Each structure stands twice: as structure tokens, then as C-alpha cells.
From Swiss-Prot, chain C:
Disease: Inclusion body myopathy with early-onset Paget disease with or without frontotemporal dementia 1: An autosomal dominant disease characterized by disabling muscle weakness clinically resembling to limb girdle muscular dystrophy, osteolytic bone lesions consistent with Paget disease, and premature frontotemporal dementia. Clinical features show incomplete penetrance.
Keyword Acetylation: yes
Interval of the full protein contained in this chain: 232 to 403 of 806
Modified residue annotations for N6,N6,N6-trimethyllysine: 84
Species of origin: Homo sapiens (Human)
UniProt keyword terms in alphabetical order: Acetylation, Amyotrophic lateral sclerosis, ATP-binding, Autophagy, Charcot-Marie-Tooth disease, Cytoplasm, Disease variant, DNA damage, DNA repair, Endoplasmic reticulum, Hydrolase, Isopeptide bond, Lipid-binding, Methylation, Neurodegeneration, Neuropathy, Nucleotide-binding, Nucleus, Phosphoprotein, Transport, Ubl conjugation, Ubl conjugation pathway
Superkingdom, natural source: Eukaryota
Name this protein carries in UniProt: Transitional endoplasmic reticulum ATPase
GO CC annotation: ATPase complex; azurophil granule lumen; ciliary basal body; cytoplasm; cytoplasmic stress granule; cytosol; Derlin-1 retrotranslocation complex; endoplasmic reticulum
Record annotation: effect of changing residue 83 to A: Does not affect methylation by VCPKMT
Described purpose of this protein according to its UniProt entry: Necessary for the fragmentation of Golgi stacks during mitosis and for their reassembly after mitosis. Involved in the formation of the transitional endoplasmic reticulum (tER). The transfer of membranes from the endoplasmic reticulum to the Golgi apparatus occurs via 50-70 nm transition vesicles which derive from part-rough, part-smooth transitional elements of the endoplasmic reticulum (tER). Vesicle budding from the tER is an ATP-dependent process.
Chief place of localization: cytoplasm
Family: Belongs to the AAA ATPase family.
Length: 752, 449, 172
């Protein structure tokens, strides 16, 4: 019901835009049954609606090729109406068109160059001679002939704007030629269709700025005054200023733009004078819309503001929107990154009554955004925008635009050999072959990350699941953890349960916790934020808690996101055991983490993963299911896992075939993964020492070791040691057996 | 302005936003602002000899006004335009709905009773939102692209009780707009066990507003403080969610450490502001999840730290003592570490009620398992009673984890079947006995003895 | 012809001495576009509204001479996080920069470049796409890179025949 405004409902007037085979710039062709339904005779002047407040006039024609549900037009009228292929436009009979007395015509500057003959005589005179072609202001049409075809833009027509060009009517092309960039920018205008995702938000905005203007009679009849204030808030890059541009481009209302800091002035009372001048200019202009970009810049809380000028400006805004004298139907929109920074008196019904959340788009929303951004791009056949939409988990639309731009720039980079920057021009063949393919989009996807996570970007050493030896069950569980809620949510909605979103890795040092986190960061299809434990702590009072809150908010925005704490035992610990820690800053941080993982806020697809050497000291509430639901124990590998670890370390290593890894794994009882990696590194280093001494011998005689042999591994094992002791294993197994006793029974079976 | 008022007397001078030009001259930094405050004080003093000039001013920050203006002789009288009660809200709705095309089925008394913290601008917003919902309902008949409309649409267009109920669902007090947080939809049947706790909470939240005359008769004021303490995962925050969703009262859900700020004196200001907006929204439930973050034992931070936490807890106790019996603000606290709460928080008149949320028992565990599985397709031959008997010391979170892991295994099996059919070409409608057994094989007790 | 706009915002970052201001100087010297230099601090003024007025004047001047490049040296000085900065005249200059870089009216041919030793202290809304499209890490050079730097610096010097810059590069 919210998007009821948006639906077209398939009215008869709308017809699909189609290519016209023979119709010239001033005529259109429609099917005979469709005209019979519309009661239109041949040659009738018919008015065409267009997007962005554009309209076109043409002469209807009876075409058998044209379908009843379609209208055939050339590119000229399509340009005039600002529409693309497959769009639906209105047609209505145009009443009382009067023959023109005089029209002022201006050509496009890029066309006028290279034409020695007079443009009016060569082009306009034969084109318009006995033409009987209706024209409208702002309509760009093309005339063939001469060396180069010269487009003509009719700036002025009389009677304004509907007239029929006739031989008696005076036509002239004298004046400054229209800048090609001006017409291009007119084409490059934002509309409600250029807004992707946020369909309900756009529906609300259209109900609140477009609906009262189109049909005031609704609100005069039902006897209510529509909302007069819009606050757009969301993370940066979600489309707040884009929605403002769309509204400005395609509303008949007067639009006044206020940029936040532009109000400020050094003179006393000059800022308030600027605000009053803006509001008075809007009020003079009947229905008007005032957009205040960056509202939080000039609307801070009066109680928290220190400077008097800022508070006086906030008060001026307060009295302007809702004071003793009421606004004369002036719509006030504003956009802000920080809605909670705004003065609370502004956020009531009289001033900013409706707050619209332009949030992070979902998969379908971001597919729509990708289609909008690539509608003008040249895409190859293998491009698949649905897959790109699936991959980009945290992107907000500015990130999608960045992805498309980087894909196109990669497509251009593929042509560097054929293109020389010293060369003044590029070949036609290079222009034709240049296009964006799926490979470029995949590369851009590899480069792309959400902008909100730029601050939390950490280089991960590119570990793969195969780099980890053993831990097959843990690998499967981590992959399922990250994948099932993302790719298969309807399964959870069918079974009616939310996914678990927490895992704790506890085990001896060197056994593969951080390695599993690296494998997740590289292989899992989710955003990844990596946190060293004590990095969130700050000297200031309340700032460590703010850092925890901020990192959790970043994870929430970028969902599905994996939040990894490499050393959980630092930031999370049992409360009440720290004598100092500031003023209980450590305990307050723990409580903040507790409220973040499980509080009264709704749950998102944020997976918190923690690794700890010593799991006994972590706060018991942190371990509670719903916060780190699963406690995974990463123990010392057994012989099969030791074989797998040794093989995973030596896969790239050129190692002798006669080297026996099974014997090594058998002898290395009690060794961790770091221990076996150390054995392999020692063997590599002994081989390198041997090769260096052989090369030194060759150099001396002038004035070897392709692979790692059994003797190298023998000596490496001779210097090998066991890193984790039996007491450490005893305490880890003690924690594991406490959990096992918590299970309460050896085997659970339902009675038969 | 004052001279023009005197020339045309009797006169009334209305100073809208008085705090814009009347800050405390001591706190004022600018010379022109100070000179203006002094000039306005001088004009107010000279207002005595003025024959018929009366100055009326309005401000929403009365405290920020310079105190010298609030002595006697200048701005002598102060009128408190407060938050309207139920009958006041009904009067405001009658005023704002007199031009509306109200249907017959509407009862503005119900709309007045539902809106608790609304101040009158929120009631106008409710009327506007309801009328816009009414227009939305007819948007199928009339498309926006239509330049003109049928008259039968005008005849059809009117505001019904469904529209007011929709606006009621959408409506939130403007005061609580900065504090609003999305809360999961939880009902009292979503909670299993704690029947006595549910009844006691409903009594504490309902009786002081519905029957204050009873408390006046017996002379005993209702308690305005609750403390939830218990093992983690046992349902304190679940009860808070249920109260937020079901109870007919405003809810302010605030974590502990978000009030704290590095700037000196901002944390106490935040505490004052949250309690003030709790008063403005009464009947309001003020909930502190993890109470021990802001309310911790005094003397611990005395030795180590700046000392702002003690100031915070002092301001909290001041705010709790400030609110009177008549104002209906219920302060609920929850902590899984009761021992590290400051006992001053616990003393009578402040969080007096102490409710312990224990580890659930066998009947409670059956109730918890049934509540978790009410919306899940489960095999008839699954026995929740045996699950409750086998899970002796499990908390509610542990049982929910059992159910979630059973769901995960069922989803894994369904995906396996999908992959099998896809591979062979080129199932699991409900959770069963074996899924629950395999989930139990991983089960653990969150809370130790 | 490909159907996209080129990226228009560049944030160079790295430790001191890597060559961010050197790269800015090279770009200014060897591009055929109106180059505007903004120093971070110099915009600031004690007056209210003067500093963002300076930013508006600079961006408008770059607009009037298009195509243009604006270089904002020491961006962290002029662009701290709004959530962190307390003073109003800092929040306001950051908001002005945000509006100038991507607002309801978008700069057409202006390329805004910046250099910061610390990129995290920059306000996150600036690190967005539409403002600062791509961030380039000018990092510590390798042995070959530092050999190239030594060759660049010693091209003007007179070096004896025994001079071997390869060893000097290997040692530093
Ligand atoms: N929903 C969307 N659909 C299509 N394009 C979008 C959408 N959201 C953003 N964009 C594009 O990405 C960029 C985002 O800039 P925009 O001005 O819309 O963001 P914003 O919400 O105002 O952000 P900021 O808080 O930084 O001001 C623009 O280039 C815009 O074209
Ligand atoms: N299962 C494994 N397969 C392959 N390599 C492993 C494995 N376990 C550990 N390693 C090796 O151990 C080293 C890093 O160990 P890792 O970071 O995983 O330890 P950790 O368990 O997180 O320990 P810590 O508590 O000390 O941080 C790497 O050399 C890695 O190759
Ligand atoms: N009585 C109950 N009925 C149904 N589910 C319950 C019950 N008690 C707990 N749960 C489940 O366990 C979790 C409840 O955790 P909750 O946040 O309520 O605990 P808490 O007592 O506030 O703990 P903490 O102090 O550790 O945050 C939810 O997943 C909920 O589904
Ligand atoms: N890559 C380089 N190649 C050649 N010379 C270099 C290079 N990097 C730095 N230099 C030399 O070092 C000098 C100082 O470097 P520069 O001023 O560019 O540093 P910066 O990274 O901008 O530092 P700052 O943080 O002080 O702004 C340059 O003028 C130049 O002489
Ligand atoms: Mg913006
Ligand atoms: Mg580690
Ligand atoms: Mg809780
Ligand atoms: Mg420099």
C-alpha cells in the first residue's frame, strides 16, 4: 500500500516507445485501432508527455507495423521527451494550436562548425517550408544535408509554446549557438527513475512533495494539510542528495537549495538574514521546496552548542519553519548524515515531521542501482548484473557506482597498447572494440569494498582453505556459518529460526585459529573486519565504549559482515577482577560488547568470531549462546592432521620425493601446526645455506640444491622442539571437559 | 520594539524563542550578546512606567534563560504549558479532526487513551498520517499521473478507524525520537515460564496508572524501580522486549555506557536529559540493560580513574530521587552481575523491587522449548518433555541454541538433497528426532554452578 | 564512448617523505589544466564563515577555469571527523568541503587531489566514492625504487667514476 503511488496500473494513454522507420522529427505514427480507441483522426496535432517536465508535439500517423500497445518515434522526439527505449508516455489531443507568427531558432555549436553556407537558408528554410510541423520550446531536432548535419534548438516560439511552422511565419537562426554541453547536461538530469533501491522511501517522498502539488483537491476535500517537512538520513552514499537532485529536476515547484555552511557570515545577524532571505524567496514563489544539504552543519543542539551565532541560527530556523507566522506552502527538505545531531525541536511535527531513512540497499535494490548506473555503459554479452548484485554485500550505491567506474576504467586499460597518450586521437577500431565485459566487472568486484569499511581495511595474507591441514569439521562449520544465512535465508524462514552468529576459537598457541580467520577473510563471501583486542581502548573517558559501539555499527551497516577479535581475552574478560583499568573502563567496555551482541536492538547478519589462548578468563556472559553460540576447540593435531599440515606447508615447496611426511608426522607427537611449519622452515633455511655455500665455492673457483632432501629435514628435526607443554594441554582439556560435563550425558537418544 | 508597543497601547509584546537572546550573561562570551541581555533587562525594568505594555515570551529551554530575568518585576509570572493528559489529548484530537471527513466508526476516546506521551503536535501528526493513509487506500482508483479526478473518488474518500489505528502504530512521541531503537516483536507467549514474573511486571506497569486512587486510599505509593538479576540467557532482556512490545506505555531502551562522554560534565547532562525525556513521556518505562556499566560500586573508581563514573552515579541517584509519585516513570534495571551493583542504587525508594530471574526448571524448560518451536514445523514424534528432563541446568539461551542447531542440521540436509537432485538431473519438511539428537550432542550449559 | 565519468577525486597517503607533495608538484607542472593549491591550515580563519568562504572561492575559481585540479595539502588538518571534532568551525568547514565535492550541484571538470600522512583521521564521508574516488598509497620504496630515487637526485651532482649507486641503494 505504501508504494501504491508508484504503480502505473496500465492506463490506455501509455504506449511503449518504439523506433519509427520513416517518421520525421515532427511526426509520430500509431496503430489504427489505438487511434480509434483514442478518437484521433490522421494528421491530428497530439501532445506528448515526457519525464523531467518535458513535452513534445507531433503529427499522428496510421501505421500497420506499429502495435496498438506501442508508439513509434524517432530519436529526435525521444530526446525531446527525455525518455529511453521501452518507456511508457502519454498521448492526448492538443487543443487550440495557433499558427506561429515568429520563432527564434538556435543551433548546436558543435554542429555549426565547418558549415560555410548559411544554416538558416541551407537547413531551416527547406526543412520548414510548407512543413506544417508543430514545435515546442526546448525541442532539439536534426536536419540532413550539407557537410555536417546541424541540429536546431528552438529557444522561443510564439504563441508560447504551441505553434505550427508555416512558410508565412518568420524563422531565423541568428544568435549564439547552443552549447553541446548544455544539451548533454539537460540529457544528464536525475529523475525518480535514476533513484535505485529505497522504493518505499521514494514512494513516501513522492507522496509528500509530488502528490500535494498534482492533486491538492484531495487534501482540500479530506480536510488535512499534508506533511511539510522531510528529513532524509542515512549512511553516506545512499542517495540523499541524489533524491534532492531528482526532486529539483522534476518538480514544477520552485526549488531553493541551501548548502549548510553557506549560511554563515562574519557580519552580525548576516547568517540569520541569509536564512530569512532564503525562506522569503521561497514564500514569494507560491509552492516552493527548500532543500538544506548538510543540515547537521547549521542545526546543532542549542544546549550542546557553545557559540552564540550557531544557537541563534538554530532558533532562526525554528521560528522560520514553525513560528507565529505560518509557512505559505513551502516544503522544507533536508539531508543529514547524523540525524541525532539535529536539535530535537526541529524534529517535531511542525518543522521536520517525517524522517525518511535512506538505508543500505538490499540485493534487489543494489541490482536496480547497478542497472541504473550501467544503462548508459556499453556492456558485453557475458555481463551479469544479478551476480554482481549478489556479490556486493555492503555497497550503498556510491560503492556500486565506484565498482562500475572501476570496471569501465579496467576495460579502457585493456586497450593501452592500441592507445598512445601522445597521439592526438584514437582509432575508430579501438573505439568500436572498447566495451565493458564480465571480466572487468569481476576484477572490479575483487577491488571493491564498502566505503564505510575503508578505515577498517587490513591486508590479509591470502590464506585458502587448502592451506589449512586438518580441521575438516571446523572448516565445514565456518563455511556453513557464513553461507547459510546469506545464500539460504528462506530455509531459515521456513524452519522459523534465526541463524547462530557467534563462534569462539580456544586452543593451544599455533594450532590454527588466526589461520582459520584468514581463510574466512579470503574465502567467505562476506565483509570482514579484523580487530586486535586492545586497539579499541582509548585513554579518554567513554571513548573506548564509543569505539566498540562504532565498530559494531560498521559491522551492522556492512552486513553480512564477519567481526573477528584476534585476542578476545583482552577486550573481553571477567568483570570485577581489575583493580585499576581507569574508572572501570574495561568493565564498561565488556558491558558495551554484551549489549552489542545481544540487546534490545534487532539482530542483523553480523558474525562475531573470537580467538583466545586462555578461555577461562573471558566473561561468562560473553560465552552465552546468542553471544558466541559455538565454542570450537582447536587442539593439537593428531597424526592424520599432522600429515595434512605438513603437506599443506610444502605444497609450493619443491621437496624431494624420497622425503617421508608420514614418518615426520608420526614422530612429531605433541607438535602444533606452528611447530611443523618451523620444521619445514628450518629445512628450507638449511637448504638455502647449502646453496649459498655452493655458490660461494663456485665464485671462488671462478676467481646445486634444486629441492629439499632427507638430510635437511633430519637436521631440522634435530633442532625441532615441542612448543606446547603437557600442563598447557591439561588446562585446555580441562576446559573442554568442563564443557563436556556441562553436556550432562554421554549420548542423547529419544525414547522409542 | 518596546517604544512602538508604548506608542500603541494597550500592547502585548511576544518574544518567540526567548532563550535565543537571553542567555546567562556569565556564560555569554560575546560583547553584543551581553549588551542585548542587559538592554532587555533594562527595558523590562522600565516596563513599570509603561502604561499598558505586557511582555509575553515563549521558550522550550527555560533553564538556559538568564536568572536575573526570572526574578520579580521582570518576567514575574511563568506559565508551564505541559504535556496534556488523556482528556486533554481527546480535546486536541477533537480540534484537529473537526475539518477532517471522519467516518462514524471512529472513537477519539480510544485514540486519546492510546497516545501516552504525545504533546499535541504529535496528535496533529497522527491525524495527518491517518488522512494520508486514507488517501493511500484510494490510490488504486486514482493514479498520480492522472491530471484530473472523478468526483466519486472524493465521495469515497474519508478517514476510518483503520487509518487511525495505522497512525497509532506509526505514531511515536517527538520527544522520544532520538532514543527510539528498533525492538524485535516479542509477546508474553514468546516467553516460556516466569508466569509469576510476567504477572508481577504487568501489575507494576499497569496498576499505578489505572488505579492511582487505590494507592491514595491506602496511602502507599507504588514502587518506581525494578532490578532484574540472574544467570545470563535466562530472560531479562526478553522481558524488557516483551514490556516494550506489549505494555501500553512509552519505552526508552538505553545501554549503559552510551551516556558517558569524555568532555567534563556531559555524562551528567546526558543522564539529566534521559530522565527528563522519560518524564516528558510518562507513563514511560526506562530500561537499563547491563545496569552495572553505569551503576558500579563506589570506591572502586575513587583510587583509579578520573572519577567521572562516581559523578554519573550521583546524578543517577539524584534523578531517581527527583521524580515524584504522581509522575509515572518506571525505572527497570537488568544485570547478570548483581554483586557489583552499587548498594545505593538498591536502597528503598530507588530500584526497591528486586526480581530474580532464575535458571528455568523442568516445567519452565518445557514452556521455553514450546515457545521456541511454536513457529517451527516439528515432527509429532519429537518429545519436548524428554528434552526438558535431559537438559537439567540449561538456560533459555541454551535451549534456544539446541533448537537453532537442530534447524541448522535440517537446513544442511535440505541443501544436501537439493545438490543431490541437481547433480543427478544433469525432502526435509520438518525437524525430526535425529536432528534434535545431533543438536543435543553439541549441547552445553552456559551457566556453571 | 565507454559511457562513464572518470574518477575525479584522488587521496594520496603515506608516511612523510614518500613524495606526495612531489607528485602534486609534478602534476601541476606537467598537466595542461588550471592547478589550484590549497594548504590545509591556511584556509582557517578566526572569523565566522570566512574559512568556508575561502573554500567556496577556491572551488569556484577552479570551476571558472576548467578543466582544473585542486590540491588540498595536509587534508587531515582541514578535514577531521565531524563526530570527533568539538568546535563548530571545523565541523562547518568539513561540511562545506563535503558539499563542494559532491552536492546538489556537482563539479563538472574539477579534479580534487589531497595528500595526508594519516588517512584514518579524515572524515569518512570524504573517503566516500563521490568525494574521493580512489586512494593511492605512496609507500616506502623498494631497493630498485630507491636506486631510481638516488639516480634522480644525483643526476645534477658530479660523481666520480668509482661511484656505484646500486650498493648505496642496497644499504639504505
Ligand atoms: N539509490 C541510488 N541509486 C542510484 N544511484 C545512487 C543511489 N545512491 C547513491 N547513488 C549514486 O552514488 C553517489 C552517492 O552520492 P549522493 O549525493 O547521492 O549521496 P548522499 O546520500 O548525499 O551522501 P553524503 O552523506 O556523503 O552526502 C551519487 O553519484 C549517486 O549518483
Ligand atoms: N592446521 C594448520 N595447517 C597449516 N598451517 C597451520 C595449521 N595450524 C597452524 N599452522 C601454521 O601456524 C602458523 C600460524 O598459526 P596461527 O596464527 O593459526 O596460530 P593461533 O592458534 O592463532 O595462535 P596464537 O594463539 O599464538 O595467536 C602459520 O605458519 C600456519 O601455517
Ligand atoms: N523464558 C524464555 N522463553 C523463551 N526463550 C527464552 C527464555 N529465556 C531465554 N530465552 C532465549 O534465550 C535468549 C534470552 O537472552 P536474554 O537477552 O533475554 O538474556 P538476559 O537474561 O538478559 O542475559 P544477559 O544478562 O546475559 O544479557 C533468547 O535467545 C531467547 O530466545
Ligand atoms: N619518490 C620520490 N622520488 C624522488 N624524490 C623524492 C621522492 N619522494 C620524496 N622525494 C624527495 O623528498 C622531498 C620531500 O618529499 P615530499 O615533500 O614530497 O614529502 P611528503 O610525502 O609530501 O611529506 P609531507 O608529509 O611532509 O607533506 C621531495 O622534495 C624530493 O626531493
Ligand atoms: Mg549529500
Ligand atoms: Mg592468533
Ligand atoms: Mg541482556
Ligand atoms: Mg608535503
Amino acid at each position: 500500500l505504501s508504494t501504491a503511488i508508484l504503480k502505473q496500473k496500465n492506463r490506455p494513454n501509455r504506449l511503449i516507445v518504439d523506433e519509427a522507420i520513416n517518421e520525421d522529427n515532427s511526426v509520430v505514427s500509431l496503430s489504427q485501432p489505438k487511434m480509434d480507441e483514442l478518437q484521433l483522426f490522421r494528421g491530428d496535432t497530439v501532445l506528448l508527455k515526457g519525464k523531467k517536465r518535458r513535452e513534445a508535439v507531433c503529427i499522428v500517423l496510421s501505421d500497420d507495423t506499429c502495435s496498438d500497445e506501442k508508439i513509434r518515434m524517432n530519436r529526435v522526439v525521444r530526446n525531446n521527451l527525455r525518455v529511453r527505449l521501452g518507456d511508457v508516455i502519454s498521448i492526448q489531443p492538443c487543443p487550440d494550436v495557433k499558427y506561429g507568427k515568429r520563432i527564434h531558432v538556435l543551433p548546436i555549436d558543435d554542429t555549426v562548425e565547418g558549415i560555410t553556407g548559411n544554416l538558416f537558408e541551407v537547413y531551416l528554410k527547406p526543412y520548414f517550408l510548407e512543413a506544417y510541423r508543430p514545435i515546442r520550446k526546448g525541442d532539439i531536432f536534426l536536419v540532413r544535408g550539407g557537410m555536417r548535419a546541424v541540429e536546431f534548438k528552438v529557444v522561443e516560439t510564439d504563441p508560447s509554446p504551441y505553434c505550427i511552422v508555416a512558410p508565412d511565419t518568420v524563422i531565423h537562426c541568428e544568435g549564439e549557438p547552443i552549447k553541446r554541453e548544455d544539451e548533454e547536461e539537460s540529457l544528464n538530469e536525475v529523475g525518480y527513475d535514476d533513484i535505485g533501491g529505497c522504493r518505499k522511501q521514494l514512494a513516501q517522498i513522492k507522496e509528500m512533495v509530488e502528490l500535494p502539488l498534482r492533486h491538492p483537491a484531495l487534501f482540500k476535500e479530506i480536510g488535512v494539510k499534508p506533511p511539510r517537512g522531510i528529513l532524509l538520513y542515512g549512511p553516506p552514499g545512499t542517495g540523499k542528495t541524489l533524491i534532492a537532485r531528482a526532486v529539483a529536476n522534476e518538480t514544477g515547484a520552485f526549488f531553493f537549495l541551501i548548502n549548510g555552511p553557506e549560511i554563515m557570515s562574519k557580519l552580525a545577524g548576516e547568517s540569520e538574514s541569509n536564512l530569512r532571505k532564503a525562506f522569503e524567496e521561497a514564500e514569494k514563489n507560491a509552492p516552493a521546496i527548500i532543500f538544506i544539504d548538510e543540515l547537521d552543519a547549521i542545526a546543532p543542539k542549542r544546549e550542546k552548542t557553545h557559540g552564540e551565532v550557531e544557537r541563534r541560527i538554530v532558533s532562526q530556523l525554528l521560528t522560520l519553519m514553525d513560528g507565529l507566522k505560518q509557512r505559505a506552502h513551502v516544503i522544507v527538505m533536508a539531508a543529514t548524515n547524523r540525524p541525532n545531531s539535529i536539535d530535537p525541536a526541529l524534529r517535531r511535527f511542525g518543522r521536520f515531521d517525517r524522517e525518511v531513512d535512506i538505508g543500505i540497499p538490499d540485493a534487489t535494490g543494489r541490482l536496480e542501482i547497478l542497472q541504473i548506473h550501467t544503462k548508459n555503459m556499453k556492456l558485453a554479452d557475458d555481463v551479469d548484473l544479478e551476480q554482481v548484485a549478489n556479490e556486493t554485500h555492503g555497497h550503498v550505491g556510491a560503492d556500486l557506482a565506484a565498482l562500475c567506474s572501476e570496471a569501465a576504467l579496467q576495460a579502457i586499460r585493456k586497450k593501452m597498447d592500441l592507445i598512445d597518450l601522445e597521439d592526438e586521437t584514437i582509432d575508430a577500431e579501438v573505439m568500436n572494440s572498447l566495451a565493458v565485459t564480465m571480466d572487468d566487472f569481476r576484477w572490479a568486484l575483487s577491488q571493491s569494498n564498502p566505503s564505510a569499511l575503508r578505515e577498517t581495511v587490513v591486508e590479509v595474507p591470502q590464506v585458502t582453505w587448502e592451506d589449512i591441514g586438518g580441521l575438516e569439521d571446523v572448516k565445514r562449520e565456518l563455511q556453513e556459518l557464513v553461507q547459510y544465512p546469506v545464500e539460504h535465508p528462506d530455509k531459515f524462514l521456513k524452519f522459523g529460526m534465526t541463524p547462530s552468529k557467534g563462534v569462539l576459537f580456544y586452543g593451544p598457541p599455533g594450532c590454527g585459529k588466526t589461520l582459520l580467520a584468514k581463510a574466512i577473510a579470503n574465502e567467505c563471501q562476506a565483509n570482514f573486519i579484523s580487530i586486535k583486542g586492545p586497539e579499541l581502548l582509548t585513554m579518554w573517558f567513554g571513548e573506548s565504549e564509543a569505539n566498540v559501539r562504532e565498530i559494531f555499527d560498521k559491522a551492522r551497516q556492512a552486513a553480512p559482515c564477519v567481526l573477528f577479535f584476534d585476542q578476545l581475552d583482552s577486550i573481553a574478560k571477567a568483570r570485577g577482577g581489575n583493580i585499576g583499568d581507569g574508572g572501570g573502563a574495561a568493565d564498561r567496555v565488556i558491558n558495551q560488547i554484551l549489549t552489542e551482541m545481544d540487546g534490545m536492538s534487532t539482530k542483523k547478519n553480523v558474525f562475531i568470531i573470537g580467538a583466545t589462548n586462555r578461555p577461562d578468563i573471558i566473561d561468562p556472559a560473553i560465552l552465552r549462546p546468542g553471544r558466541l553460540d559455538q565454542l570450537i576447540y582447536i587442539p593439537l593435531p593428531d597424526e592424520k592432521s599432522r600429515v595434512a599440515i605438513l603437506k599443506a606447508n610444502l605444497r609450493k615447496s619443491p621437496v624431494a620425493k624420497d622425503v617421508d611426511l608420514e614418518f615426520l608426522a608420526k614422530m612429531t607427537n605433541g607438535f602444533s601446526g606452528a611447530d611443523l611449519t618451523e620444521i619445514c622452515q628450518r629445512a628450507c633455511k638449511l637448504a638455502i645455506r647449502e646453496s649459498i655455500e655452493s655458490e660461494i665455492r663456485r665464485e671462488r673457483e671462478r676467481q646445486p640444491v634444486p629441492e629439499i632432501r632427507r638430510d635437511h629435514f633430519e637436521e631440522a628435526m634435530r633442532f625441532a622442539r615441542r612448543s606446547v607443554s603437557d600442563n598447557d594441554i591439561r588446562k585446555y582439556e580441562m576446559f573442554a571437559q568442563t564443557l563436556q560435563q556441562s553436556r550432562g550425558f554421554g549420548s542423547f537418544r529419544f525414547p522409542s
